[PDB]
Amino acid sequence: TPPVTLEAARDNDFAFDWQAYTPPVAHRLGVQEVEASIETLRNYIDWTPFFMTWSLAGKYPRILEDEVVGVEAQRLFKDANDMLDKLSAEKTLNPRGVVGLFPANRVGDDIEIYRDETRTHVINVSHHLRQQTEKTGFANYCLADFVAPKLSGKADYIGAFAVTGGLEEDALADAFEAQHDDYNKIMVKALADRLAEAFAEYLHERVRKVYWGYAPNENLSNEELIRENYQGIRPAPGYPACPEHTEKATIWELLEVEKHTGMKLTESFAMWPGASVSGWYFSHPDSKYYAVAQIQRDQVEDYARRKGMSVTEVERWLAPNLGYDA
Ligand SMILES: Nc1ncnc2c1ncn2[C@@H]1O[C@H](C[C@@H](N)CC[C@H](N)C(=O)O)[C@@H](O)[C@H]1O
């Protein structure tokens, strides 16, 4: 669909009656280091992407009884769970994370994150982009729209997290590599990835039920979790609703991620360990995933100003989303 101006997109923001709504208050404000054992996380694994990593099609568990790939899938599953058993018993891969909840309000396309409930001093701003093509029957979405506008005077909140399958991932993979054991190098990396993603799923449930606490009686099966049958989202920088990777630096500062977990950011703002997930938490019932997609020069320049960056800098970080030749 054809581009619209930045002002036209903002005039089509998510429509919601904030005066009639009470955002749920975060029960546990502040930052908390967390850990999770392999025994705990293995009940939150989504196995279907594991089999995709091994080039097998089909959803788990039905893939195990498949007529052509089932026997191979069963052997992969057995080797995977034997390796989880060993990693668990030997404590050689140790998932870690950190979670935080903060007072927050929307201003424009950004989310102000406050030091405290006086909502004066801003400790960080979470910057977001807005869809910028002609939308029929939908808002031009921006993740900031899911937090109450500061002008509404409603007390709202935002969360953030960072989790990893464990800092030991490289040492375990590198040992298999030195042995020319490609199978087990792929296996331990695929397991660390499942453990990181399982930790993201588990911690999000902890946030909905307890840390934020807006869904204390939620009782979903793992299959229902995989289907996202809960209220709220956990969008991650680099994914289509928030594609701009340098916002991971804001999460790293907000949560003191490196101090609490050992996890690091590269110059490309990739996470280390490789098996890592970081992102935000939104509680709003209408919050959903979508793609920002292609944006125009006016929004690039505005984003640069808000970020304290030059236009040239931002055109690097936003290159995949530029709707024009830079
Ligand atoms: N459009 C989007 N914008 C932002 N984050 C997204 C988007 N789509 C997916 N995500 C993120 O990706 C997650 C979904 C999956 N990657 C992870 C769970 C899945 N069961 C798996 O193991 O692959 C979401 O919970 C978000 O953190």
Distance CA 241, CA 128 (A): 9
Helix (H) or strand (E) holding 276: strand 276-281
Q: Which atom of ligand 1 is nearest to the CA of 45?
A: 22
Query: Is the CB of residue 289 below 6 angstroms from any atom belonging to ligand 1?
Result: yes
Distance 236 CA to ligand 1 centre (A): 7
Q: Do 173 and 252 fall within a single domain?
A: no
Q: Do 40 and 56 fall within a single domain?
A: yes
267, 316, 299: which is closest to 110 by C-alpha? 299
Q: Tokens 């960056």 label which residue?
A: 309
Query: Is the CB of residue 147 below 6 angstroms from any atom belonging to ligand 1?
Result: no
Query: Is the CB of residue 230 below 6 angstroms from any atom belonging to ligand 1?
Result: no
Q: Do 176 and 211 fall within a single domain?
A: no
Distance 226 CA to ligand 1 centre (A): 10
* Total residues found in the chain within this entry: 326
Residue ID of nearest Cα to ligand 1 atom 3: 241
234 has binding-site annotation: yes
Q: Which atom of ligand 1 is nearest to the CA of 204?
A: 25
Facing residues of 279 across strands? 161
Distance 144 CA to ligand 1 centre (A): 18
Phi, psi of 136 (to 5 degrees): -110, 115
Distance CA 164, CA 108 (A): 32
Residue 297 is encoded by which pair of tokens?
Answer: 């020069």
Q: Which among 163, 239, 288 is the best mutation to test ligand 1's pocket, defined by most ligand atoms within 8 Å of the CB? A: 239
* Alpha-carbon radius of gyration of the chain: 21
Query: Is the CB of residue 205 below 6 angstroms from any atom belonging to ligand 1?
Result: no
Q: What is the CATH number of the domain that holds 74?
A: 1.10.288.10
Q: Do 14 and 69 fall within a single domain?
A: no
Distance CA 267, CA 57 (A): 35
Q: What is the resolution of this structure in A?
A: 1.5
Q: Do 172 and 289 fall within a single domain?
A: no
Q: Domain residues for 296?
A: 1-35+96-164+193-326
Domain finish residue from 151, 177, 192: 192
Q: Do 141 and 205 fall within a single domain?
A: yes
- Please enumerate in sequence order all residues whose Cβ is within 8 A of that of 21, keeping only pairs 6 or more positions apart, or say none: 148, 154
**16, 21, 119, 201 from 146: Cα distances, Å:** 9, 12, 18, 21
Q: What is the CATH number of the domain that holds 17?
A: 3.10.196.10
Report the number of distinct structural domains present in the chain: 2
Q: Do 206 and 245 fall within a single domain?
A: yes
79, 59, 84: which is closest to 69 by C-alpha? 59
Phi, psi of 142 (to 5 degrees): -145, 135
Distance 277 CA to ligand 1 centre (A): 10
Q: Do 284 and 301 fall within a single domain?
A: yes
Q: Do 118 and 57 fall within a single domain?
A: no
Q: Do 147 and 204 fall within a single domain?
A: yes
What is the DSSP code (8-state) at residue 188? H
Domain finish residue from 144, 174, 192: 192
Q: Do 218 and 100 fall within a single domain?
A: yes
Q: Report helix, strand or coil for 107.
A: strand
Q: Which among 42, 126, 234 is the best mutation to test ligand 1's pocket, defined by most ligand atoms within 8 Å of the CB? A: 234
**161, 221, 257 from 32: Cα distances, Å:** 10, 26, 10
290 has binding-site annotation: yes
Q: Tokens 């960072």 label which residue?
A: 162
Q: Do 84 and 10 fall within a single domain?
A: no
Phi, psi of 110 (to 5 degrees): -120, 165
Distance CA 95, CA 98 (A): 11
Q: Which among 289, 290, 292, 321 is the best mutation to test ligand 1's pocket, defined by most ligand atoms within 8 Å of the CB? A: 289
Domain finish residue from 174, 192, 210: 192
- Please enumerate in sequence order all residues whose Cβ is within 8 A of that of 279, keeping only pairs 6 or more positions apart, or say none: 160, 161, 200, 234, 235, 236, 237, 251
Residue ID of nearest Cα to ligand 1 atom 23: 49
Mode of pairing for the β-strands spanning 96-107 and 156-164: antiparallel
Distance 201 CA to ligand 1 centre (A): 10
Q: Which atom of ligand 1 is nearest to the CA of 241?
A: 3
